Design a protein around this ligand. Structure first.
Ligand SMILES: [K+]
Ligand SMILES: [K+]
Ligand SMILES: [Mg+2]
Ligand SMILES: [Mg+2]
Ligand SMILES: [Mg+2]
Ligand SMILES: [Mg+2]
Ligand SMILES: [Mg+2]
Ligand SMILES: [Mg+2]
Ligand SMILES: [Mg+2]
Ligand SMILES: [Mg+2]
Ligand SMILES: [Mg+2]
Ligand SMILES: [Mg+2]
Ligand SMILES: [Mg+2]
Ligand SMILES: [Mg+2]
Ligand SMILES: [Mg+2]
Ligand SMILES: [Mg+2]
Ligand SMILES: [Mg+2]
Ligand SMILES: [Mg+2]
Ligand SMILES: [Mg+2]
Ligand SMILES: [Mg+2]
Ligand SMILES: [Mg+2]
Ligand SMILES: [Mg+2]
Ligand SMILES: [Mg+2]
Ligand SMILES: [Mg+2]
Ligand SMILES: [Mg+2]
Ligand SMILES: [Zn+2]
Lengths: 16, 86, 190, 169, 292, 77, 117
RNA sequence: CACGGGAAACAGCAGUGAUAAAAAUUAAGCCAUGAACGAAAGUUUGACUAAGUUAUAUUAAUUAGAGUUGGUAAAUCUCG
RNA sequence: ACAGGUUUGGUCCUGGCCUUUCUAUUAAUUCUUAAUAAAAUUACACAUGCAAGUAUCCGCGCCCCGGUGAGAAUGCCCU
């Protein structure tokens, strides 16, 4: 699933 | 309303008159009696041997209220209410 | 009232014919309500204790009428002759307590055959009537069934070797419990 | 329906009475017809009458119209394996085309009736649950079993309140 | 090669024995009435509509099967004496699956004594109804089938309904079905109400019961009084097929007659009370000659 | 029910477990029953496993499947 | 719902009103709630005797062996329930509880008679 | 979002302050079922089971008050 | 909707508002008992007790159950 307003979260990958 | 009702009811066409002007039998198919072809009126005089022309799609004027009720879309809170005796 | 012996006697009596006549009981009764659309639910009961509440319902205004399964003439008036369905409470005007009595009485009467109702023709349950299959026919006994031996060797109780008992006592020393022997074969009744 | 030339063809019964079910390999149906000439009477009536019925039974099949591009009306079917079926209609009537289509690519009567037969077993009568998916909702709705305590109150000996009272006493 | 109810010979005899009355077979029932539908038909189309009703009538007249009493089930799959007093009630296990016919399902009961045994027919039919409900079948035995209630229905000539209730409620090879059907057949014989089951699909059952109980005196008298002779001799012809090794059937081979004389053979040979039969047949003959 | 990050209680922070007593004769017999019982169920589990393989194989490449595939192909041509 | 892990399990799901239990034999993911979404409902189990003194149990045998064949775990009560039907051998804990009942009853009989004398 | 920062967490059961027209017990048990762990007897579980409280709904009975009475719309007189 | 009240000295037509039906919450007045269902102001701040342990050490499990509707036109169906 996806939408046209997806925000590129980066902190989640940074924390990982 | 009173004049319109009597004018409409006085313009009613009976089965016998329909049979005479068509010269064909009129058969009543009761739903509770199964596929039994009950005959209600017979055309007095000459009986036409030519069958009615069968149209695949009839050209009739339908009222939107009748079709809406038939398809089950009328969901008012006053149509199905329980009322007193006649 | 002296009519409990035969409730249908009142229906055949001259008093009923004189008052109601050919028309049903609920023909002359009209229910007073708040406007054009009557409430979908009538009074719960109009005979509370010993007080008659206002304009009574057709059944609660003459106490000589008894709602039982014996009399069919009274119950026929509350069932549609052509459609064969039970009239709802707003259609007649009876109180809800008596309406419940009518439905139970009508249902009981149809169970005893005193009243006619539609019986659809029903096809037989099964397509082929065969008793040959093993689900209904008796199967050969098991070799362990005829002998009387339990179906599995470990279903019965077997005395363990004393060496194994000593090993368990050493392993579970300190928190040991009193051991028991073979169970009784049959349990008596208190 | 009041508006329209033939209002009867816009009711649920008319959309549901057309029995033409394509096979799973049929994806695209292309219909070309002419708006003039007596030869195109069968094609035009087919578009005006039967196409709503065909699409209703095949929601996943694309149906596209093209008017006045080819002098001879025809129908073109595109399969999943790239196969092209060409149906030529130049004098066939409205009824003939539907019978012709039903045989080249329609499904057989035995296949349809066995398909819904296997669909019935999904709603097994022996299950319990909500009314929308199962017949009964609880075991108390079966005659003979212990009824729901809401309708008929249970005897005191079976109530847990009485069971706990004697155990504590 | 004993005669059976499904033979083509007996079926064809009984098909024309019951007759075909469109008005009685299609009777308006007490259901949710809907407005009728009218259409215009010619004379030719009317016969087509009539013959379709005849075919629908024939399908509606499929006689229910009749069988003998079923043998009781007494089978023990296993015995476990370790569970003698663990539980007080008994467990009933029913295999449910839409693909398995109801005659092959496994219904197994765990009695409190610990014996794993198959369920008897009385409980086996109850369990099938519980998990596979269908119209008209009560889980418990209805009170309508008591002896007292049957007489009330019989006094109101509800014989056609009682048979229709019995086929829906009980299993055709069950014990209760047989005793109810035989009791109904015995009562209509006593009151001479054979006219009620003329066009009813249940007419084959009572005719077959009479031909096996050697009680045709009552049935033959009514048919002659109804001026239905062509089917009456067919009933006698049925008798010879079912009971060949008898004096009556021997006469049919000796004399070798036809028509009403076939009834005369039985009337003077095996008929218990042939006085009425011969006099009524005489009454029919003189009346028919006068009518002709 | 608690979560991973919440702290445990204070009163029940000293005890760990208190196993019950063991009847020697009863425990050995019970252990022997389980060893045979688990063995029996495992064989049934593998027998049912092989049944599923047979059912799935016949639905994919069974003889009737080839008849069906050829019949529709022959009809289409 | 998307769960991290869990194993397919055949278990009993509670139902009915208070003081009137009713269990449905269902097969669902172990991490889903007891009355939550399930794969397929198999049978039923009425815990209370009816007027005939019977506790009705329903089993979908061809489907039950299908889920067991594909690796479905069984809980304690369904194993006891299947063991009674005969589909499985009697659960070892079912027998031991029976033996404990006899010994307790035997102690009860002796204790009553000892006080009597 | 949560490396970090503000900052020091009941949107788990029960309960409290504030606030709102909105008012359940700071209670019992793992006997049943469900989940976790153990080979196993078994243990934990405010999920749940059985209870406490409230006309919020439905039923039965042991229970009698409220509203309305110009018209739509069932129903009144005498005084102020 | 089977419709009803209301424009005007008055009739017809067009056109609003409202009545009559059912469900929930709060409040007023009133209240005897039993059973079942349900329990609902607030993503505001929280005292105290409890809600994840099991197990011959390893390990496995630890918003999984449960709670809420803040957020997002989020989504439903489907590959
Ligand atoms: K527990
Ligand atoms: K108006
Ligand atoms: Mg509950
Ligand atoms: Mg928390
Ligand atoms: Mg809280
Ligand atoms: Mg918070
Ligand atoms: Mg407060
Ligand atoms: Mg509240
Ligand atoms: Mg307060
Ligand atoms: Mg307090
Ligand atoms: Mg506790
Ligand atoms: Mg304990
Ligand atoms: Mg436990
Ligand atoms: Mg384990
Ligand atoms: Mg409670
Ligand atoms: Mg007042
Ligand atoms: Mg004006
Ligand atoms: Mg005015
Ligand atoms: Mg309040
Ligand atoms: Mg209470
Ligand atoms: Mg270990
Ligand atoms: Mg939730
Ligand atoms: Mg809110
Ligand atoms: Mg919001
Ligand atoms: Mg926004
Ligand atoms: Zn009353």
């Amino acid at each position: 699933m996806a939408r046209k307003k997806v925000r590129p979260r980066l902190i989640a990958e940074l924390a990982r | 309303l009173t004049r319109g009702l009597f004018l409409g009811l006085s313009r009613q066409e009976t089965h016998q008159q329909l049979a005479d002007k068509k010269s064909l039998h009129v058969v009543e198919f009761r739903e509770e009696c199964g596929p039994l072809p009950i005959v209600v009126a017979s055309p007095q005089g000459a009986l036409r041997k030519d069958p009615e022309p069968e149209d695949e799609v009839p050209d009739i004027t339908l009222d939107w209220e009748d079709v809406k009720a038939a398809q089950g879309m009328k969901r008012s809170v006053w149509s199905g209410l329980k009322r007193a005796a006649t | 009232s002296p009519y409990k012996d035969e409730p249908w006697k009142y229906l055949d009596s001259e008093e009923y014919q004189n008052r109601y006549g050919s028309r049903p009981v609920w023909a002359d009764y009209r229910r007073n309500h708040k406007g054009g659309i009557p409430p979908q639910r009538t009074r719960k009961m109009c005979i509370r204790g010993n007080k008659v509440a206002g304009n009574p319902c057709p059944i609660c205004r003459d106490q000589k009428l008894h709602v039982d399964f014996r009399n069919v003439k009274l119950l026929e008036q509350f069932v549609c002759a052509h459609t064969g369905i039970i009239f709802h409470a707003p259609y007649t005007g009876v109180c809800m307590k008596q309406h419940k009595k009518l439905t139970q009485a009508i249902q009981k009467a149809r169970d005893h055959g005193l009243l006619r109702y539609h019986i659809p023709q029903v096809e037989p349950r099964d397509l082929d009537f065969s008793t040959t299959h093993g689900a209904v026919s008796s199967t050969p006994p098991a070799p362990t069934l005829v002998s009387g031996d339990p179906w599995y060797p470990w279903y019965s109780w077997k005395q363990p070797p004393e060496r194994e008992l000593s090993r368990l006592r050493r392993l579970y020393q300190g928190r040991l419990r009193e051991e028991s022997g073979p169970p009784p074969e049959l349990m008596p009744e208190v | 329906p009041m508006k329209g030339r033939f209002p009867i063809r816009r009711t649920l019964q008319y959309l549901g009475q057309g029995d033409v079910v394509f096979k799973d390999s049929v994806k695209v149906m292309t219909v070309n017809y002419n708006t003039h000439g007596e030869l195109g009477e069968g094609a035009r009536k087919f578009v005006f009458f039967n196409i709503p019925q065909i699409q209703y039974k095949n929601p996943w099949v694309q149906i596209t119209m093209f008017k006045n591009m080819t002098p001879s009306p025809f129908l073109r079917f595109y399969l999943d394996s790239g196969e092209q079926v060409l149906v030529d209609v130049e004098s066939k009537s409205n009824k003939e085309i539907v019978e012709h289509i039903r045989k080249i690519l329609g499904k057989n009567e035995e296949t349809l009736e066995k398909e819904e037969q296997e669909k019935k077993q999904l709603s097994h009568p022996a299950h319990f649950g909500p009314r929308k998916y199962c017949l009964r909702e609880c075991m108390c709705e079966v005659e003979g079993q212990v009824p729901c305590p809401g309708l008929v109150p249970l005897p005191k000996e079976m109530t847990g309140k009485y069971k706990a009272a004697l155990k504590a006493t | 090669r004993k005669p059976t109810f499904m033979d083509e010979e007996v079926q064809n005899i009984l098909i024309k024995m019951t007759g075909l009355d469109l008005q009685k077979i299609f009777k308006p029932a007490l259901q949710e009435l809907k407005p009728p539908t009218y259409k215009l038909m010619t004379q030719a189309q009317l016969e087509e509509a009539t013959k379709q009703a005849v075919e629908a009538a024939k399908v509606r007249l499929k006689m229910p099967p009749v069988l003998e009493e079923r043998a009781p089930i007494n089978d023990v799959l296993a015995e476990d004496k370790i569970l003698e007093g663990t539980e007080t009630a008994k467990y009933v296990f029913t295999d449910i699956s839409y693909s398995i016919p109801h005659r092959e399902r496994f219904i197994v009961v765990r009695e409190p004594s610990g014996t794993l045994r198959k369920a008897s027919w009385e409980e086996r039919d109850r369990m099938i109804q519980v998990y596979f409900p269908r119209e008209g079948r009560r889980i418990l035995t209805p009170v309508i089938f008591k002896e007292e209630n049957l007489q009330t229905m019989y006094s109101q000539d509800q014989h056609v309904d009682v048979l229709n209730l019995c086929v829906a409620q009980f299993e055709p090879d069950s014990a209760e079905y047989i005793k109810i059907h035989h009791h109904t057949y015995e009562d209509i014989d006593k009151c001479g109400k054979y006219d009620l089951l003329r066009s009813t699909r249940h007419f084959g059952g009572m005719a077959w019961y009479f031909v096996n109980k050697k009680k045709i005196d009552g049935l033959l008298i009514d048919q002659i009084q109804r001026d239905l002779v062509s089917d009456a001799t067919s009933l006698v012809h049925l008798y010879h097929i079912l009971h060949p090794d008898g004096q009556s059937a021997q006469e049919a081979k000796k004399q070798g007659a036809e028509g009403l004389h076939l009834i005369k053979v039985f009337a003077k040979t095996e008929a218990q009370k042939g006085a009425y039969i011969e006099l009524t047949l005489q009454a029919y003959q003189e009346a028919f000659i006068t009518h002709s | 029910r608690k979560t991973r990050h919440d702290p445990p209680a204070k009163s029940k922070a000293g005890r760990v477990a208190t196993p019950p007593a063991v009847d020697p004769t009863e425990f050995f017999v019970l252990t022997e029953r389980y060893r045979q019982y688990r063995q029996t169920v495992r064989a049934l589990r593998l027998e049912f496993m092989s049944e599923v393989r047979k059912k799935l194989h016949e639905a994919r490449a069974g003889v009737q499947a080839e008849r069906k595939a050829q019949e529709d192909a022959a009809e289409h041509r | 719902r998307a769960y991290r892990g869990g194993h397919l399990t055949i278990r009993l799901a509670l139902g009915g009103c208070t003081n009137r239990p009713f269990y449905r034999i269902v097969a669902a993911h172990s991490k889903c709630p007891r009355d939550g979404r399930f794969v397929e409902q198999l049978g039923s189990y009425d815990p209370l005797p009816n007027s005939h003194g019977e506790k009705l149990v329903a089993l979908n045998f061809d489907r039950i062996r299908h889920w067991i064949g594909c690796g479905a775990h069984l809980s304690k009560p369904v194993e006891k329930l299947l063991g009674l039907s005969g589909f499985y051998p009697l659960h070892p804990m079912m027998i031991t509880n029976a033996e404990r009942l006899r010994r307790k009853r035997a102690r009860e009989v002796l204790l009553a008679s000892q006080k009597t004398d």
